[PDB]
Design a protein around this ligand. Structure first.
Ligand SMILES: O=C(NCc1cccnc1)N1CCN(C(=O)c2cccs2)CC1
Length: 119
């Protein structure tokens, strides 16, 4: 029922995501010189360094907010992909599955802890 525990759990999951070769395309904000039409398609860029720095700044109030930004990395990949068979999109799908498998207990524990706090 530790309502703060999500933050270190998210730090550790980001560490695992950074060790994962599939996170390579998503570790730093997209280079617009390599993809000059990117901001014509993507309204809100997101990447794992931005998520980590937001977490470390103390600028997430909940793991739901972090989850929303991580999901935006993946929806940005889907939206930008010319093909569902793309290399970088295919890496996003595996990394998303890994992320979702690991974040589910972090969200459940947090929401349980906040319900207990409010009981
Ligand atoms: O440039 C990066 N990533 C930043 C970066 C900078 C330097 C080194 N390594 C990665 N993109 C943009 C393209 N992108 C896509 O999701 C898709 C492209 C094709 C199909 S989807 C995410 C990865």
């Amino acid at each position: 029922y530790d309502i703060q525990a999500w933050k270190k759990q998210c730090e550790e999951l980001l560490n695992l995501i950074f060790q994962c070769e599939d996170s390579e395309p998503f570790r730093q904000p997209v280079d617009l010189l390599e993809y000059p039409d990117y901001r014509d398609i993507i309204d809100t860029p997101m990447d794992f360094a931005t998520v980590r720095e937001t977490l470390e700044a103390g600028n997430y109030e909940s793991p739901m907010e972090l989850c929303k930004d991580v999901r935006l990395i993946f929806s940005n990949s889907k939206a930008y992909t010319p093909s569902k068979r793309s290399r970088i999109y295919s890496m996003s799908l595996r990394l998303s599955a890994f992320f979702e498998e690991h974040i589910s207990s972090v969200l459940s524990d947090y929401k349980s802890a906040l319900r207990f706090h409010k009981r």
